[PDB]
Every structure is written in C-alpha cells, then in structure tokens.
Paper text:
Here, we report the cryo-electron microscopy structure of the human m3C tRNA methyltransferase METTL6 in complex with seryl-tRNA synthetase (SerRS) and their common substrate tRNASer. We show that SerRS acts as the tRNASer substrate selection factor for METTL6.
Deviations occur exclusively in the m3C-RBD, in particular in the divergent N-terminal region, the substrate-binding loop and the β-extension. All RNA-free structures display disordered substrate-binding loops, which seem to adopt their shape only in contact with the tRNA, and a conserved helix following the substrate-binding loop is rearranged on interaction with the ligand.
Residue numbers in the entry: 41 to 50, 60 to 66, 79 to 193, 218 to 246, 259 to 269
Amino acid sequence: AQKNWDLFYKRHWTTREQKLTMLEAGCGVGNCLFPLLEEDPNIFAYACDFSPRAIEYVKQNPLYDTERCKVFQCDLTKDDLLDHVPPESVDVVMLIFVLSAVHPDKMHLVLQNIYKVLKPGKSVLFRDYGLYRSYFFTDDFLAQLFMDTGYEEVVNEYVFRRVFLQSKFLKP
Ligand SMILES: Nc1ncnc2c1ncn2[C@@H]1O[C@H](CSCC[C@H](N)C(=O)O)[C@@H](O)[C@H]1O
C-alpha cells in the first residue's frame, strides 16, 4: 500500500475553500493548504500523510511555517491521531481525495480516528470520486459510512464537473 503512494512522490481543492483549527488528512505536499494558511494567519493546521516522502516535500515548501501548521506522518487506518492531535480540539477536518485510497474494510478506522479529535459541534468537509488503487463511492454507500462511524450528514451530493462527490458530515 504505502509503497505505491511513496513511489508517486518522485485530486485538488476546488472552491471547497476566527481561531479555526484544522486537520488535513492525506495532506499531500500541501499545495492548496499552505496558500490558505498564508492568506489567513488565524488558521492552525495539523497535516498528516501516509507517505514520508510526502512529509519531507511538505517541510521543503517555502510557505511551510512551523507556528501556523504542524505536520506529522500517520496511517489513519492503524496509527492513532490522538497521539499528535489533542482530543476534541479541531474545528475542521478535511477528507479530500483520501478516503478513496483507503481500502473499504479499513475505511472506517479512519472516520473513527478523525472522530476523537473533532470538536463535538464541528464537521468534516469531504471531497472524493463518486460513481453514478482507489475505489469510487455512491452517495448512499458514503453517508452510511459516517453514520456507521457516528457522524451525522449535513450534505451529500454528486458533482458532474468520472464523477466527484461533495459531502459535509457533522459530529454530534
Ligand atoms: N490510510 C492512509 N493514511 C494516511 N494517508 C493516506 C491514507 N490513504 C491515503 N492517504 C493519503 O491520501 C492523500 C490523497 S492526495 C493528497 C491530498 C490532496 N492534494 C488534497 O488537496 O487534499 C495522499 O497524500 C495519501 O498519502
């Protein structure tokens, strides 16, 4: 698994864009996130990625500042988010083009990990491929997955823009 994702380092925000605290799972090289962080200085981010070759690229980018963003390697499927992220401390979690890469059987080990750090009021902005080594999701299969892992859906919607899905789920 991670082997394939690490080989690649040798799927972008699309108008998805205060004391906001945010986590970007599968941050990547943080191409969209780092610009956002410069534009607003309030935002503190915890960026986590499966591949270490990606985390070094993230540190290399000039935009990277250590006091507006914390970057750490983590496999959400097995590694624990709480060890680097304080509990119920995040106002936004963004799963963008990342749940697809995770296997369906393990796909909820992440929604649960993200769940502990998410503040009870705050939600999880989602952006991923839909249908009607990634996998694609029908709008119902996905809403069930947050429901199975305890989150409550505010928005689930396919975008035609190969398909995309825009979904917002709120932790109770
Ligand atoms: N189980 C897993 N644990 C951690 N990161 C994972 C993962 N499965 C996929 N990823 C990460 O998912 C990311 C998706 S692509 C990068 C993010 C995208 N550019 C954005 O703007 O959000 C990759 O960086 C990959 O390493």
